[PDB]
Symmetry: C2
Subunit: 224 residues, 2 copies
C-alpha cells in the first residue's frame, strides 16, 4: 500500500504526487501506478532548486501526474521548472509547459528536444552541463538499458541511479528485457566511482538509502 | 524458508530433495538454491513411472541433488531412470548414470545427447515421443527462452510449464534477459490450447496450482 510504503518518511501530498525533501532545495517526487491491480509501484524523480527556477529529473508515471509536479514548482515553490532531464527512455506534459527537455542522444532511437553531449569519460559537457547545473550528469555505460544515465549532487552527497540501481535488499534486477547484461556490472562500478562520496543513494523504484544499494546492485549484476 | 514453503503440502525428504506426489506414479522433485544468501529458491521437476522404470523431467539445481533423484528412483522406487527430458537449457550427473537425455534441438546452441523431433504443430514425434511416453512433449514457441518446451500428462490432468509459466499471483515474469518477449503471450496461449483440460499446472519455480497460473502468465506476457 502507499500508506505502508510512506510510513517511514515525512511526505507532503499534492494531488497524486508525494514530495519528500532529500536536502535543502532537493525534492524527491514519487508517484504510483497500479495498472493490473497487483499493487501500487513507486516511480521516483527529483526536483532541484536553482535560484528562482527548478530542474526536473524524470517525469512521473503519467501526464496528469507530471502536470502536478510542474504546478507544484510554479504555484507552491514559485520556482517554475525551466529544464528537465530524463534518465531512461509524461514528455508531452513537459513540452506543453515549454520545458527544455534533455536526454542521452541515443535514447529512444516523444523524444526529448535536446541531446546531451557526453565526453568520453561519461561526463556531460556543453549546454546540458550548464543548463542542468547543479546536477552533474554521468553516463556510466549500458545496464538497465543501453543509454541509461545518472545524476549527482556531489556538494550535497546525493546520487541518483535511475532504473539502474536497485534496493540494498533486492534479490533481482527486475526486468532485463532491454538490458546490456554483459556491461551492467562495470556500469555500476563506473557510477559508484563517478559519485564516490555520496551517502544518500536515490533511485527510480525504491526509496532512498545508503551505498548498500550500489553494493547489492553490483553483486546482482556480477551474476548475469 | 523451506519449512514455510512446504508447510502446505505432504513432503517426503531424501537427502536435499523434497518429493511430493501429484498423482499415482507422478512425483514432483523440488530442490533449493541459496547462492547469494538471499533465501532458498525452489526448482521443480517431475519423476514419472512407466512400468519398471521412470522418466525424469528436468534436473535439480546441482549435480549432487540430481544424483539423489536418480538414487531415489533406483533405490527406493526400484524403478530406475531410463530417460530424461530438460525443458530449457546436473546434466553430467545424468550422463554419468547412462541416462538417455532429450532436449529441443536448438537449446544450448553439456548438451543433451538426443534432439527431439518436433512437428510443425509443436508436438514431439519419433523416438522422443516413444521414449518419453506417457509424457506428451510440446514446443509452444519462444517465451522465457527461444527453445523452452513443456510436457503434459493429459490422462491425469497435469501439465508442466517449465520456466515459462509463473504463479497465479505473480506480478512479473522474472528474468527476461533471454526471453522472446514478442512471442511470449502467443506461446502461452499455445501451451494452454495444447493441454486444454488439465487442472493441475506445475512449473519450475512455484508450487503446483490451477489454471490461474496460465491466466496470470498470459496477462503479464501481453504487457511486454
Ligand atoms: Ca491535469
Ligand atoms: Ca546556454
Ligand atoms: Ca559479487
Ligand atoms: Ca553424490
Ligand atoms: Ca525406440
Ligand atoms: Ca490481458
Ligand atoms: Cl534509455
Ligand atoms: Cl571527449
Ligand atoms: Cl537479476
Ligand atoms: Cl560524490
Ligand atoms: Cl532453452
Ligand atoms: Cl511436421
Ligand atoms: Cl514482467
Ligand atoms: Cl489437457
Amino acid at each position: 500500500s502507499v500508506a505502508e510504503q510512506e510510513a517511514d518518511r515525512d511526505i507532503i501530498r499534492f494531488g497524486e504526487v508525494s514530495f519528500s525533501q532529500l536536502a535543502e532545495g532537493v525534492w524527491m517526487h514519487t508517484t504510483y501506478l497500479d495498472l493490473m491491480g497487483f499493487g501500487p509501484i513507486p516511480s521516483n524523480g527529483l526536483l532541484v532548486v536553482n535560484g528562482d527556477n527548478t530542474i526536473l529529473v524524470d517525469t512521473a508515471w503519467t501526464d496528469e501526474q507530471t502536470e502536478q509536479i510542474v504546478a507544484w514548482a510554479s504555484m507552491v515553490l514559485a520556482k517554475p521548472v525551466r529544464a528537465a532531464v530524463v534518465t531512461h527512455a509524461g514528455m508531452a506534459a513537459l513540452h506543453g509547459a515549454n520545458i527544455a527537455t534533455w536526454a542521452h542522444p541515443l535514447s529512444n532511437e516523444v523524444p526529448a528536444r535536446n541531446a546531451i553531449t557526453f565526453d568520453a569519460n561519461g561526463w556531460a559537457t556543453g549546454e546540458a552541463a550548464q543548463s542542468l547545473a547543479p546536477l552533474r550528469l554521468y553516463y556510466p555505460g549500458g545496464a538497465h538499458t543501453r543509454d541509461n544515465i545518472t545524476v549527482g549532487l556531489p556538494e550535497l552527497g546525493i546520487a541518483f541511479g535511475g532504473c539502474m540501481i536497485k534496493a540494498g535488499d533486492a534479490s533481482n534486477l527486475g526486468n532485463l528485457a532491454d538490458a546490456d547484461t554483459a556491461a551492467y556490472a562495470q556500469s555500476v562500478r563506473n557510477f559508484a566511482a563517478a559519485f564516490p562520496d555520496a551517502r544518500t543513494i536515490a533511485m527510480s523504484h525504491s526509496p532512498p538509502e545508503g551505498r548498500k544499494a550500489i553494493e547489492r546492485t553490483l553483486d546482482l549484476a556480477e551474476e548475469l
